[PDB]
Design an enzyme around this catalytic site. Structure first.
Site, mmCIF file in Angstrom:
data_model
loop_
_atom_site.group_PDB
_atom_site.id
_atom_site.type_symbol
_atom_site.label_atom_id
_atom_site.label_comp_id
_atom_site.label_asym_id
_atom_site.label_seq_id
_atom_site.Cartn_x
_atom_site.Cartn_y
_atom_site.Cartn_z
ATOM 1 N N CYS A 1 3.926 1.066 9.445
ATOM 2 C CA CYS A 1 4.019 0.401 8.203
ATOM 3 C C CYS A 1 5.396 0.268 7.580
ATOM 4 O O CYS A 1 6.021 1.406 7.447
ATOM 5 C CB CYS A 1 2.958 0.784 6.986
ATOM 6 S SG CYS A 1 1.449 0.920 7.343
ATOM 7 N N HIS B 1 0.884 -0.917 -0.051
ATOM 8 C CA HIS B 1 -0.151 -0.079 -0.210
ATOM 9 C C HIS B 1 0.870 1.413 0.120
ATOM 10 O O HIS B 1 0.312 2.265 -0.150
ATOM 11 C CB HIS B 1 -1.073 0.011 1.106
ATOM 12 C CG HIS B 1 -0.605 -0.199 2.548
ATOM 13 N ND1 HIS B 1 -0.393 -1.610 3.078
ATOM 14 C CD2 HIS B 1 -0.181 0.435 3.445
ATOM 15 C CE1 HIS B 1 0.060 -1.740 4.114
ATOM 16 N NE2 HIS B 1 -0.038 -0.390 4.578
ATOM 17 N N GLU C 1 0.801 -8.612 -0.251
ATOM 18 C CA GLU C 1 0.899 -7.235 0.374
ATOM 19 C C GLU C 1 2.067 -6.853 0.545
ATOM 20 O O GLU C 1 2.658 -5.910 1.436
ATOM 21 C CB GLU C 1 0.092 -7.371 1.873
ATOM 22 C CG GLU C 1 -0.279 -6.016 2.261
ATOM 23 C CD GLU C 1 -1.152 -5.029 1.524
ATOM 24 O OE1 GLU C 1 -1.910 -5.485 0.676
ATOM 25 O OE2 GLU C 1 -1.075 -3.694 1.510
ATOM 26 N N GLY D 1 1.282 4.722 11.368
ATOM 27 C CA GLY D 1 2.796 5.041 10.669
ATOM 28 C C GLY D 1 3.788 4.090 10.893
ATOM 29 O O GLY D 1 5.059 4.483 10.864
#
Length: 183
Positions: free
Chosen positions: A149, A42, A73, A147
């Site tokens: 990730c 993402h 992902e 925050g």
């Protein structure tokens, strides 16, 4: 929460990690070998990214899926830069591994140089993440924050995964498997 995991974690971050901004956010990014690194899918890196506040071209990006097209992902990216990462593929597992104590390592402007002991890592498997069916998910329990990730999940001598979401007291990583980096 054990020393060796932290010691490994700090060594890996100091040599191979950076802070990256895309159009979508600010992420921890781990380099793996040569000019190849990994981001959460993402993050959606564009033709360039900001890596430690410096514009860097992206030569290739691969959004990983399994043999049946199911989302993993993770996005692997190849950077247009001269320095090479230390090759750390020897610290990747051949398949999902569970451990009793892991550390999640973050480095962004919001969380500079932080390490979090997250305890046990479970091979959870299938997850519907935001509406997208996703596989090879690892789960661990700690007080999550936005925050995080791209944070790097590690145990003594292993890079286990890349943090790709979380809410409440539940975090999830994409498992970082050795064969993703063949070639």
């Amino acid at each position: 929460m054990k020393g060796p995991a932290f010691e490994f974690a700090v060594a890996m971050m100091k040599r191979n990690a950076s802070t990256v901004k895309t159009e979508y956010g600010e992420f921890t990014m781990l380099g793996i070998y040569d000019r190849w690194a990994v981001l959460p899918r993402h993050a959606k890196p564009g033709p360039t990214i900001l890596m430690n506040d410096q514009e860097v071209g992206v030569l290739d990006a691969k959004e990983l899926v399994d043999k049946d097209g199911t989302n993993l992902e993770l996005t692997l990216l190849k950077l247009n830069r001269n320095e090479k990462f230390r090759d750390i593929r020897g610290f990747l597992a051949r398949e999902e591994v569970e451990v009793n104590e892991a550390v999640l390592a973050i480095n962004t402007s919001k969380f500079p140089n932080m390490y979090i002991p997250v305890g046990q890592v479970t091979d959870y498997g299938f997850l519907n993440l935001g509406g997208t069916p996703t596989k090879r998910m690892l789960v661990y329990n700690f007080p999550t924050r936005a925050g995080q990730c791209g944070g790097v999940l590690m145990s003594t001598g292993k890079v286990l995964g890349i943090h790709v979401g979380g809410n409440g007291h539940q975090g999830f990583s994409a498992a970082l498997l050795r064969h993703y980096f063949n070639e």
